[PDB]
Design a protein around this ligand. Structure first.
Ligand SMILES: [Zn+2]
Lengths: 82, 178, 325, 135, 213
RNA sequence: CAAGACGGACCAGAGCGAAAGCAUUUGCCAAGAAUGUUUUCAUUAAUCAAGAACGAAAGUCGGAGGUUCGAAGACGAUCAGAUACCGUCGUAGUUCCGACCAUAAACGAUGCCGACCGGCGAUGCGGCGGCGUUAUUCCCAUGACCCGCCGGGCAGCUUCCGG
């Protein structure tokens, strides 16, 4: 208290903070690259997707909507993009 | 050989554990009764053995342990062990007046008073012991003394201030050949 | 056959079993109970007082600091232990005894430290207290020299050495299981079960750990692998500003802080005893309460009273219309 | 006159001890409860309405019932305690305790102590008003 | 003046074959005086027998209502009528910082006895729990209730009174409910607290013979 | 056996609702907060004279029903002067349906919206990150606990922030 550099805070405090209460707004979501266990097709899936996404050339369910992050089916592979 | 089993709540387990020697020693020493505490059924078990001196001692011990479980001190129920003409009468606080919520809590307050003082004053005049469970009142004493104590408590929990109750019970205790 | 204060405190009529009955003067002069002091003026006088030369006291001291029981014992306990050591050296050969005691081995279980095992009355699934078991329920019951000691720490160091010990019973004891307090900050163990602040780091952090000692000299400690024991739930809460005067009650943070004197009056701290021969002459079945003293208006309570209230965590919800003293 | 039982086994009755807040009833019945054996009130032992619910009347009642049951061969009793129940108070009074102790003294083996007080699930309105009850 | 108990008779009252102890007591019946038959007069009596008086090893907080049906020469043959927990046990089980879950079914046995079963269960505090309360949410409560109804419905429909009474004595239904409800919320003290007799078939004499011996 | 009533204990400084208020099971019906979103619109907002929905209990009209309780009223006791208290019975009412009434210590005796100024950990819901125990070691997720973090809540403790 009484001594806090408001311009340059630690990354731990900014990741701890609510997303609208950061020094500059930044979302907590991401676009993850998903590969089905069956086919080789690349799909891009939002981390908090509300809709059930299907593989285009396989017609296979990739994830289910949840209260927060969309959980993937078992066996699917994913990586966070950039 | 017959037995009596009485339950214990979760809030009286630790007082039972701390006061356990002071409970089981008078029951087994001069009354001659077997005693155990079943942890699975949460029951105090009192039994008659060959060493029991007389009949109805097991009833005396059952009243003693029941009074301890209801919230009385170990010596105040050892009074039930020694004396014959002592009883344990209890009632709910809503039995005389339908009280809801905060009103009810205030009624509990004016059985206790500040620091418990009011309660102790009744215990000084009526020669009883009063235990206040959460919505329950238990009186230990003689029959006429139980009547005086319940009159004081019922007067308190329908609105009377404590000073009027003190004056009334002191006049009654003067009239009761105490 | 040496007698500690626990022999006379528990009324051990054991002068017949022994012949080398040796006691210190300070074990017999520090007793304050009137009944056993009256008993000592009636009992047959076969005991004789004997004082140890201090080389044995020195050696008992350096392995008392090694066994981890030196803060637990007192000075007169060291005197009694040196007395039985020096008589075992004087009469029996000394080479029977091993020094520099063994290492303790760790074996933990899932049982809570507050599980009521080895309590005589309690029974899980028979365990009965009968009139034929009262004289026998003392502790876990199991040639020329012996002890009459009930304190556990002396027994712990004594069986760590290897002297046979006996109690107010007849037959000697081979195994001793009990409880100790262990600090989980500084890892210093105390045999004093009454204390709540440890002697080394001074924090309110001692927790119960069970111990078992064999006659061979093996100590082993049972810990509890229960996360409820080491849970920091109600430990951090806002404390009020420190207050002084004649009526302040501070939150008791250290073992030696100076509290103001707030004692109950003698009428307030009398409990009725019902088996007195003159009890029936009384006008009331119970002792009259204290409603007139100044300690009644200040709501002074006994130290043992209200223990479960202190055990609730302060960051919780009490009932709306109550105040916690 | 009574059951033809060997000395080892006991004859069981069921003693309903109902302590109302004006007197006390000691009602020994069959194990079924349909056929009765004995019953004396607080009022048939003391000749005063003031002392009708007193433990004196209850204990005299218990001795009278115990003697009558010794006459008819019943040696042991199960106990079914009772208060008025319903809207009223639920705890059996000191008269029920006095009757229980007095029949315990009078040579009776005691079976099961069980409380049947008619606790309502969800009651009707109390006999007193909003102002209160009992002085 | 004339003693009423001189004309009375003592009849044996005996339990069915499902229990180890048969003779559950004596009953007092006024003799047949021409108009009313003593055998017919005793035929509608309900006996409240604690289960520890019926089996040696079994716990004593369960009571069986047993109704008599036939008279066999100073023997009163008896049949199962109901079952209920002791009020002391019920008052001890209802603690504060937990949830009470109730269920009931109207279910019919294979031999025509229509019963009403009640089931009580409590949420359990775990052995490492720090929180004071163990409240279950409403959908969890509904799922537990639905599972209890399904379990006791399938356990009573497939049997008659013989196996139903034989599984009510150790409460196999209660232990099955406790084991099956762990995947939703851990249950603490589950019992079939009450069994009611709603409908009985036409009375048969042979049926009581295999129920007795 | 029937009748009407009421949903105890569980039941908490817990929850929901604009308030009055709301607690037996199941099903149906439309609502709603909060949370989550790198969704969409792009100032659409706040407070509001006039006006309008809801509004405990009591009470008034029509119908039904009346278990308990019960104003009035009838008795019995109680006393220099008692006509309120107490006990028994009991009508309107207390219950339901459809119309009225718009009042309470209808309370936090504290307008609503927005901003800033000390701290702490419990709880309710949602979300996130997790080493472990459990659904007799669960074959993988998922429920129950355990440790933190974020958002909106019901509240609490502490403080010489300032008043
Ligand atoms: Zn330490």
């Amino acid at each position: 208290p009484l001594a806090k550099d408001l311009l340059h805070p630690s990354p731990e405090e900014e990741k701890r903070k609510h997303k609208k209460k950061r020094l500059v707004q930044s979302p907590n979501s991401y676009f993850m690259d998903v590969k089905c266990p069956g086919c080789y097709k690349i799909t891009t899936v939002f981390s908090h997707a509300q809709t059930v996404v299907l593989c285009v050339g396989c017609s296979t369910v990739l994830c289910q909507p949840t209260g927060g992050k969309a959980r993937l089916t078992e066996g699917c592979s994913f990586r966070r993009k950039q | 050989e017959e037995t009596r089993k009485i339950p214990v709540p979760a809030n009286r387990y630790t007082p039972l554990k701390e006061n356990w020697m002071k409970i089981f020693t008078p029951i087994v020493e001069h009354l001659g009764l077997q005693i155990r505490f079943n942890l699975k059924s949460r029951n105090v078990e009192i039994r008659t053995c060959k060493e029991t001196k007389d009949v109805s001692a097991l009833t005396k011990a059952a009243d003693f342990v029941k009074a301890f479980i209801l919230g009385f001190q170990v010596e105040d129920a050892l009074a039930l062990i020694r004396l014959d003409d002592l009883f344990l009468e209890s009632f709910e606080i809503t039995d005389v007046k339908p009280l809801k919520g905060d009103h009810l809590s205030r009624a509990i307050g004016r059985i206790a008073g500040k620091g418990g003082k009011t309660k102790f004053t009744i215990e000084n005049v009526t020669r009883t012991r009063i235990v206040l469970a959460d919505v329950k009142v238990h009186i230990l004493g003689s029959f006429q003394n139980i009547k005086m104590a319940r009159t004081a408590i019922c007067n308190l929990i329908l609105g009377n201030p404590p000073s009027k109750v003190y004056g009334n019970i002191r006049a009654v205790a003067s009239r009761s050949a105490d | 056959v040496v007698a500690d204060a626990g022999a006379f405190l528990r009324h051990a009529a054991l002068q017949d079993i022994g012949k080398n009955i040796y006691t210190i003067r300070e074990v017999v002069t520090e007793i304050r109970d009137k009944a056993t002091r009256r008993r000592l003026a009636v009992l047959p006088y076969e005991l004789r007082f004997k004082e140890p030369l201090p080389e044995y006291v020195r050696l008992v001291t350096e392995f008392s600091k090694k066994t981890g029981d030196y803060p637990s014992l007192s000075a007169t306990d060291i005197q009694v232990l040196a007395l039985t050591y020096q008589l075992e050296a004087e009469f029996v050969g000394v080479s029977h005894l091993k020094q520099e005691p063994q290492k303790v081995k760790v074996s933990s279980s899932i049982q809570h430290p507050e599980t009521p095992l080895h309590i005589s009355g309690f029974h899980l699934p028979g365990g009965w207290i009968t009139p034929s078991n009262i004289k026998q329920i003392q502790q876990e019951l199991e040639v020329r020299v012996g002890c009459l000691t009930t304190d556990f720490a002396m027994q712990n160091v004594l069986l760590q050495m290897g002297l046979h010990v006996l109690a107010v019973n007849g037959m000697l004891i081979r195994e001793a299981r009990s409880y100790i307090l262990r600090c989980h900050g500084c890892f210093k163990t105390t045999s004093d079960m009454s204390r709540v602040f440890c002697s080394h780091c001074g924090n309110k952090t001692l927790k119960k750990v069970s111990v078992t000692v064999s006659d061979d000299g093996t100590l082993h400690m049972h810990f509890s692998r229960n996360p409820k024991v080491l849970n920091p739930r109600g430990l951090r809460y806002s404390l009020p500003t420190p207050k002084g005067g004649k009526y302040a009650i501070n939150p008791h943070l250290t073992e030696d802080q100076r509290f103001p004197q707030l004692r109950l009056s003698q009428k307030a701290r009398q409990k009725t005893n019902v088996f007195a021969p003159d009890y029936i002459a009384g006008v009331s079945p119970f002792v009259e309460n204290d409603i007139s003293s100044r300690s009644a208006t200040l709501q002074v309570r006994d130290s043992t009273l209200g223990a479960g209230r202190r055990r609730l965590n302060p960051n919780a919800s009490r009932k709306k219309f109550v105040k916690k003293r | 006159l009574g059951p033809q039982v060997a000395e080892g086994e006991n004859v069981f009755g069921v003693c309903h001890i109902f302590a109302s807040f004006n007197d006390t009833f000691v009602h020994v019945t069959d194990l079924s409860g349909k056929e009765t054996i004995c019953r004396v009130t607080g009022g048939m032992k003391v000749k005063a309405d003031r002392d009708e619910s007193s433990p004196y009347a209850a204990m005299l009642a218990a001795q009278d019932v115990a003697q009558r049951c010794k006459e008819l061969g019943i040696t042991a009793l199960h106990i079914k305690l009772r208060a008025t129940g319903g809207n009223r108070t639920k705890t059996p009074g000191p008269g029920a305790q006095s009757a229980l102790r007095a029949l315990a003294r009078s040579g009776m083996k005691i079976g099961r102590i069980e409380d049947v007080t008619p606790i309502p699930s969800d009651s009707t309105r109390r006999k007193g008003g909003r102002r209160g009850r009992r002085l | 003046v004339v003693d009423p108990f001189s004309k009375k008779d003592w009849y044996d009252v005996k339990a069915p074959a499902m229990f180890n102890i048969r003779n559950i007591g004596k009953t007092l019946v006024t003799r047949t005086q021409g108009t009313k038959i003593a055998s017919d007069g005793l035929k509608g009596r309900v006996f409240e027998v604690s289960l520890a008086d019926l089996q040696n090893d079994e716990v004593a907080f369960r009571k069986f209502k047993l109704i008599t049906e036939d008279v066999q020469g100073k023997n009163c043959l008896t049949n199962f009528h109901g079952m209920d927990l002791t009020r002391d046990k019920m008052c001890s089980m209802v603690k504060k910082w937990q949830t009470m879950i109730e269920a009931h079914v109207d279910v019919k046995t294979t031999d025509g006895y229509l019963l009403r079963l009640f089931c009580v269960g409590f949420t359990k505090k775990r052995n490492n729990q720090i929180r004071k309360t163990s409240y279950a949410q409403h959908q969890q409560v509904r799922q537990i209730r639905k599972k209890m109804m399904e379990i006791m419905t399938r356990e009573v429909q497939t049997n008659d009174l013989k196996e139903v009474v034989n599984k009510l004595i150790p409460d196999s239904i209660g232990k099955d409910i406790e084991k099956a409800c762990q995947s939703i919320y851990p249950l603490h003290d589950v019992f079939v607290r009450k069994v009611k007799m709603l409908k009985k078939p036409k009375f048969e004499l042979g049926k009581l013979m295999e129920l007795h011996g």
